Amino acid sequence: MREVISIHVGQGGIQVGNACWELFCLEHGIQPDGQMPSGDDAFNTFFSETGAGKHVPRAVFLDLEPTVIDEVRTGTYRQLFHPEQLISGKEDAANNFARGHYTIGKEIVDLCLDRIRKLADNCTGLQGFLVFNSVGGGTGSGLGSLLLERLSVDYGKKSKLGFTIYPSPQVSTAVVEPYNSILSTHSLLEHTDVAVMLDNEAIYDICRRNLDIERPTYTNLNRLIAQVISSLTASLRFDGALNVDITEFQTNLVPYPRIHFMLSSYAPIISAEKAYHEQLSVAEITNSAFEPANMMAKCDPRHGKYMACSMMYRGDVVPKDVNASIATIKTKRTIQFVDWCPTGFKVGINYQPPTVVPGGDLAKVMRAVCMISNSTAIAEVFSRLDHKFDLMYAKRAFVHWYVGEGMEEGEFSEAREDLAALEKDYEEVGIET
């Protein structure tokens, strides 16, 4: 009777959700047509029984340009979804935040919230929401912000989980991503209980180093993200010695209401070649989970203290070995925590082993770790985006196309001062008493 509503908005959101739903359907055994193969009741987290036979995912797909929607509707997953919840627009916002937040998104958020209400009515023990969008796209950022502000007043205290992909320092595709990013962070700084850091160059280095892939495409990235999500959410649909629900995320990862941006890691990530020769023990895997190169974001944790760390072990991990490993991490000196946090570790355990997609790149491993960390060093991304924004805004480049959409001049200034407030808050928290 536990359920969560998932929203995929924007190109990145849709592409990630495709792999996410492939992974969920394979993990729960449901065929692409939706019919049960030739009860346990563990799908109630992500699927709803139709009454006789197949099942319906608890997801809503939304975007203004119908290319990806048409691809999904023509793909092998035509029968799985609800042909009415795959809402597609007419014309894309073209990386313009004002276009998506003021012009075209206004007549689509109505039907979007109607679908959300329809799903929530069927839902009974609703835990919360997942939102998947990219920040480097105008439509994604604007409609995500609009949808979240609407939900904040429609539902209120229900938890929201934000899986947003921030731009990397050097590698990026557009030219105006930082404007959208600063506007969207201004919007979402006070509307979401959590946000995760998922920049692209980090996973690029991940797959080039561990998986040792030379030119991987977006499919591998989305598959890794789906693995992370499944590891996070398996505790609500599988039995474990340490049961953990979403409520014990913002309970243990949010020391102050403003500080709610974390970065993630997953292990192991090994092909068949190198895992045939290596131990895969709990102590070594959790040691590798903390090393500077397996985080999902380009940040240097040695440049800042830690605030709170929560990791889920999935497989057959033993709590005694977990405790010994945590003690070893404590005795490690290169990792240091903030003074006012004696203990900041939240460990969870699940018996269900990880699952691998056929034709994928991952190897089948009986232990896995998904790690979510909030640390003081996250301020560097905000600093670099702020500096880039100042660089473009020095001579007001590209401003007039936003202005001509109806946009006012001052939100750039107030977003700038809000980001300054955020960074000074991080710096003040990071100081020792």
Binding site: S172, T217, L391, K395
Partner: protein, 430 residues
């Protein structure tokens, strides 16, 4: 949904349009009779982008042909794929243009444009969801250079929100085929600079040079050149008609390309281009695609980008390749040519990927660029203008049809302005 109409006027524009339509028909597998004989189902998913459906299963282009002479019309009608166009869309006068911008834009154009405006507004009302317009014209002639900008303004006042591109052929002194280029060219660009949303400039000298040296053709012809430019312009809307990893339509290109409202002149290019023999020894890889597309050799205009700094660049790759290899190649080239890129705009390169390669090729890239290089062409044409205007030669013809020198003075002043505030950002430092 997501469609763009095409209007062609003048000899050069009509030839561009005919070759473009032939190229698109071949790409989408449509025979001249208008019947479909393609293979992939995906070949027809967005046929409505450029075509309209007719009774019996036939497809018709949404193109309009206009001019003051019927020679071009009945020459292109008897040619290959000439029966695609609906005959009611042919609009032609009988007086001629005389390569006189004033005579074309004021004496006959005002009376003739009624039918073409009616038909274009009919098409715009009929289409599902219009996004923009595309116009092919040459600046060195009378009829094209006049009624092109005339129709531009006329479309603009009732479509201020829709986007619009012009593939404009600019005149150059090395290849000059008329004596009155400066006058009509500056007169037209005076209104293009204030009414056009995007203008891609094409140079005959650059086309000849590329087809002589890179292509190594023994006997290049106008048909070959028109095919080259047609392929280059068709590459722009690759992801607009086909799926892709990173979709980027025309409005996305606009928002990523335009830093200031009046700076909307671009130079394009296509790759790979290999001669008859060297293609045997050649291979296909993203590094050499990037090298060839960033060669100033591959540009479609005589302006040399090594003499200026790029403002914004964009690359539409087409075929199946991974995003990163491309993206860090862009990173490396930006680092290597950092002094040749504007310094106060980090990461001024756009990358887009489409998954449907051109027929016969495994992968191909179309480059678009906005850089300080084009100021040379404006300075050159302005110098020719002032040289021809100092003695008032050829001026009495214009002045005999309600023209006067004052708006010529504002046109040259506006050109000098555009040059000044276009060079201003070249030395601007943060």
């Amino acid at each position: 949904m997501r469609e763009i109409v095409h209007i062609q006027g003048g000899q050069c524009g009509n030839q561009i349009g005919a070759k473009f339509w032939e190229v698109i028909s071949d790409e989408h597998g449509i025979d001249p009779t208008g019947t479909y004989h393609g293979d992939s189902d995906l070949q027809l998913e967005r046929i409505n982008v450029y075509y309209n459906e007719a009774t019996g299963g036939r497809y018709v282009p949404r193109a309009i042909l206009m001019d003051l002479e019927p020679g071009t019309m009945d020459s292109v009608r008897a040619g290959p794929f000439g029966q695609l166009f609906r005959p009611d869309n042919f609009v032609f006068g009988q007086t001629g243009a005389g390569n006189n911008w004033a005579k074309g834009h004021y004496t006959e154009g005002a009376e003739l444009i009624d039918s073409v405006l009616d038909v274009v507004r009919k098409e715009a009302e009929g289409c599902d969801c219009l996004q923009g317009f595309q116009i092919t014209h040459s600046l060195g002639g009378g009829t094209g250079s006049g009624m092109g900008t005339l129709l531009i303004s006329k479309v603009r006042e009732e479509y201020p929100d829709r986007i619009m591109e012009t593939f404009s052929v600019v005149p150059s002194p090395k290849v000059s085929d008329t004596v009155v280029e400066p006058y009509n060219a500056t007169l037209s660009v005076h209104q293009l600079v204030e009414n056009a949303d995007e203008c891609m400039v094409i140079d005959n000298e650059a086309l000849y040079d590329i087809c002589f040296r890179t292509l190594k053709l023994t006997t290049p012809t106008y048909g070959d050149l028109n095919h080259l430019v047609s392929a280059a312009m068709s590459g722009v809307t690759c992801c607009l008609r086909f799926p892709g990893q990173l979709n980027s339509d025309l409005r996305k290109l606009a928002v990523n390309l335009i830093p200031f409202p009046r700076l909307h002149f671009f130079m394009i290019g296509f790759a790979p281009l290999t001669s008859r023999g060297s293609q045997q020894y050649r291979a296909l890889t993203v590094p050499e695609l990037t090298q060839q597309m960033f060669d100033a050799k591959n540009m479609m205009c005589a302006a040399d980008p090594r003499h200026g700094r790029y403002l914004t660049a964009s690359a539409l790759f087409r075929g199946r390749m991974s995003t990163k290899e491309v993206d860090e190649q862009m990173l490396n080239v930006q680092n290597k040519n950092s002094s040749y890129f504007v310094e106060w705009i980090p990461n001024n390169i756009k990358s887009s990927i489409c998954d449907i390669p051109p027929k016969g090729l495994k992968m191909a890239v179309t480059f678009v660029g906005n850089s300080t290089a084009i100021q040379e062409m404006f300075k050159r044409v302005a110098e020719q203008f002032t040289a021809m205007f100092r003695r008032k030669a050829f001026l009495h013809w214009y002045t005999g049809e309600g023209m006067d020198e004052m708006e010529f003075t504002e046109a040259e002043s506006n050109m000098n302005d555009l040059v000044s505030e276009y060079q201003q950002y070249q030395d601007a430092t943060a």
